[PDB]
Design a protein around this ligand. Structure first.
Ligand SMILES: OB(O)c1ccc(/C=C/c2ccc(B(O)O)cc2Cl)c(Cl)c1
Ligand SMILES: *B(O)c1ccc(/C=C/c2ccc(B(O)O)cc2Cl)c(Cl)c1
Lengths: 116, 115, 115, 116
């Protein structure tokens, strides 16, 4: 698990459950290629997106589908999604946790990057 | 003046209006002495709290009554209030903006310190 | 105008000055079309991006070049940029402020939407 | 473990390690009584502050000593500490995670409240 996503809900004070997440990797032609996807569990965590072998050096985009989340709760939010774009593994393999804290008109994201 | 407070609402995407704010200065006996207070404006801002002459170096606490704000909107909040505790330092820039972004179970705060 | 962008630096406690900002509008073929751009001022603000007439309902992306900002300060950042993607809606209030608070490995963004 | 504190560093993209945390509870005379303290581990987490029996209804203040943290890293921060004040267990026993994300001139905090 070199890539994990965690999502929290700042309105309910809870994990954000059943949040869809799509990961893209920039290809040689500079387009965004689909790389992995999944949804957060009851704990707000999404594990198993990729493997150490598959998660090579590259520019990755983690799209967290916040609008679908809020609308599934009957709330009309501001943003379409939260996007997190970063270069990964440029100094060799690392483990990445992308965390996001959601409100209807605001979000924050941080990364925790560790060396295994 | 040298101290402004700005409060935003992350749920509604708006200034947080009519929020009570209290500023305290730390006394020699380590207690918190009332210093200044007011309510945020329609723009979520509270100006005119103090003056350059009165705002000396020291430790200050800005207490924002977030609980009343959320209850007035019919929303159940986690915190009793938000508190921002910091040292005023003459070495650094002269004007302090303390900004707070409010959610029912979360808040963020930053300082914008300029000349 | 109807759209302002404000960028703050959480490390130095200051406006984020001379940060490049690009605004895109989503086209019918789902691609991102350049719409407006500029660099933040000494106050961390970028005004005059668009007008009421040009800023129609639709999906917009605000891309903030955070990587260059941090590198110019000699600090190693995590993100390639910060992106804020949202729908402009005529039903809601008329003026949009997109604010971003920057750290090397984190950012926060909020929308202040007023009449 | 009805009360856990987690602290992250937004400058380094890491857990905030060795952060001192002091918890107070408001007493009948309206003063802040020392309740528990500890420091964050290598994972940025502080476990074992209290027990279900001891963690009764009350108003609690969690003081995270952010200034000592930044200064131990040779950085002069703005805030003295981050304070989190909340009523706990007013609708019966809950589990609380208090999370904080730190920068030198800014911090954010959120709560995750679960029912065991
Ligand atoms: O399991 B984990 O690795 C993990 C990671 C992050 C968190 C919390 C993150 C967080 C805290 C405050 C703010 B503010 O702005 C923003 C964020 Cl994103 C937790 Cl509770 C667990
Ligand atoms: B925490 O993640 C966080 C706190 C505050 C703010 C925003 C501050 C701000 C927004 C807008 C204006 B304005 O319209 O002139 C001024 C300020 Cl100081 C954010 Cl984004 C995040």
């Amino acid at each position: 698990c070199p890539l994990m996503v965690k999502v929290l809900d700042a309105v309910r004070g809870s994990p954000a459950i059943n949040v869809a997440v799509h990961v893209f990797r920039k290809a040689a032609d500079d387009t965004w290629e689909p790389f992995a996807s999944g949804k957060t569990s009851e704990s707000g965590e999404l594990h198993g997106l990729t493997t150490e072998e598959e998660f090579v050096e590259g520019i990755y985009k983690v799209e967290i589908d916040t609008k679908s989340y809020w609308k599934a709760l009957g709330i009309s939010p501001f943003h379409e999604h939260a996007e997190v774009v970063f270069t990964a593994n440029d100094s060799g393999p690392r483990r990445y946790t992308i965390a996001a804290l959601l409100s209807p008109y605001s979000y924050s994201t941080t990364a925790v990057v560790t060396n295994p």
